[PDB]
C-alpha cells in the first residue's frame, strides 16, 4: 500500500488548501482506496486498527 502511495502521489498542477481533513488527528487525507467487500473485510484485519 505504501508503495502504491509513493508511486501515485507526485507532481500535480492546480493545487490548493488541505481538502478533506479527518476528525481524530485533523490531518489531510492523501488518497482513497476503492475496493470490494472481501478485500475490505480482509484489510481491516491485516492492518487491524
Amino acid at each position: 500500500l505504501s508503495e502504491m502511495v509513493a508511486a501515485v502521489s507526485g507532481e500535480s498542477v492546480l493545487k490548493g488548501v488541505s481538502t478533506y481533513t479527518t476528525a481524530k488527528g485533523g490531518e489531510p487525507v492523501g488518497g482513497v482506496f476503492i475496493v470490494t467487500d472481501n478485500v475490505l473485510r480482509q484489510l481491516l484485519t491485516f492492518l487491524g486498527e
Partner: protein, 67 residues
C-alpha cells in the same frame, strides 16, 4: 476580472493564479437589421395589427364599388 476563477485555481498568488498571455483580434460581423416600417415597400401596403388571423375564416371580401 469578469469571471469566477477563484476556487478553481486556489488562493495563493505565488504558486498559482491568472496571467495575461495573448492579445487576439477577430472580426465580428455586422448585419443590417431591417424592419418593415424602416424599409420603403411599406408604402404600398397599409399594415394593421389584426392580432388573430383565425377571426376571418372566409377567404373572400366584399367590395362596394360606387361610381
Amino acid at each position: 476580472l469578469f469571471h469566477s476563477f477563484d476556487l478553481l485555481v486556489g488562493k495563493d498568488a505565488r504558486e498559482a493564479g491568472i496571467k495575461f498571455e495573448v492579445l487576439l483580434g477577430v472580426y465580428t460581423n455586422a448585419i443590417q437589421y431591417v424592419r418593415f416600417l424602416e424599409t420603403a415597400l411599406a408604402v404600398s401596403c397599409v399594415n394593421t395589427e389584426f392580432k388573430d388571423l383565425s377571426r376571418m375564416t372566409d377567404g373572400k371580401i366584399q367590395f362596394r364599388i360606387s361610381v
